[PDB]
Amino acid sequence: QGDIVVALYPYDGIHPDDLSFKKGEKMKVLEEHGEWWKAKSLLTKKEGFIPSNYVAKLNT
């Protein structure tokens, strides 16, 4: 269905598919792969891979 998560910690695309997100930023996951999923930035609509320990549901 697609879950919405908010960047809890800034991420600078260090990988080829890792999507970069900045704390306070919101992201949506289009697919879950266990501990890793691919989300997209509502700001630049960019999509990449995000860890399940840097982003979460809501926050501030």
Swiss-Prot record:
Tissue: Detected in monocytes (at protein level). Detected in placenta, and in fetal brain, lung, liver and kidney. Widely expressed in a variety of organs, tissues, and cell types such as epidermoid, hematopoietic, and neuronal cells. Expressed in primary neuroblastoma tumors.
Subcellular localization(s) per the UniProt record: Cell membrane; Nucleus; Cytoplasm; Cytoplasm, Perinuclear region
Post-translational events: Ubiquitinated by CBL, leading to its degradation. Ubiquitination is SH3-dependent.
Family: Belongs to the protein kinase superfamily. Tyr protein kinase family. SRC subfamily.
Domain notes: The protein kinase domain plays an important role in its localization in the cell membrane.
Role, per record: Non-receptor tyrosine-protein kinase that transmits signals from cell surface receptors and plays an important role in the regulation of innate and adaptive immune responses, hematopoiesis, responses to growth factors and cytokines, integrin signaling, but also responses to DNA damage and genotoxic agents. Functions primarily as negative regulator, but can also function as activator, depending on the context. Required for the initiation of the B-cell response, but also for its down-regulation and termination.
Subunit note: Interacts with TEC. Interacts (via SH2 domain) with FLT3 (tyrosine phosphorylated). Interacts with LIME1 and with CD79A upon activation of the B-cell antigen receptor. Interacts with the B-cell receptor complex. Interacts with phosphorylated THEMIS2. Interacts with EPOR. Interacts with MS4A2/FCER1B. Interaction (via the SH2 and SH3 domains) with MUC1 is stimulated by IL7 and the subsequent phosphorylation increases the binding between MUC1 and CTNNB1/beta-catenin. Interacts with ADAM15. Interacts with NDFIP2 and more weakly with NDFIP1. Interacts with FASLG. Interacts with KIT. (Microbial infection) Interacts with Epstein-Barr virus LMP2A.
Illness: Autoinflammatory disease, systemic, with vasculitis: An autosomal dominant disorder characterized by systemic autoinflammation manifesting in the first hours of life with diffuse purpuric skin lesions, fever, hepatosplenomegaly, and increased C-reactive protein. Additional clinical features include periorbital edema, conjunctivitis, urticaria, atopic dermatitis, abdominal pain, and arthralgia. Laboratory studies may show leukocytosis, thrombocytopenia, and autoantibodies.
UniProt-recorded name of the protein: Tyrosine-protein kinase Lyn
Species this protein is from: Homo sapiens
Residue span relative to the full protein: 64 to 123 of 512
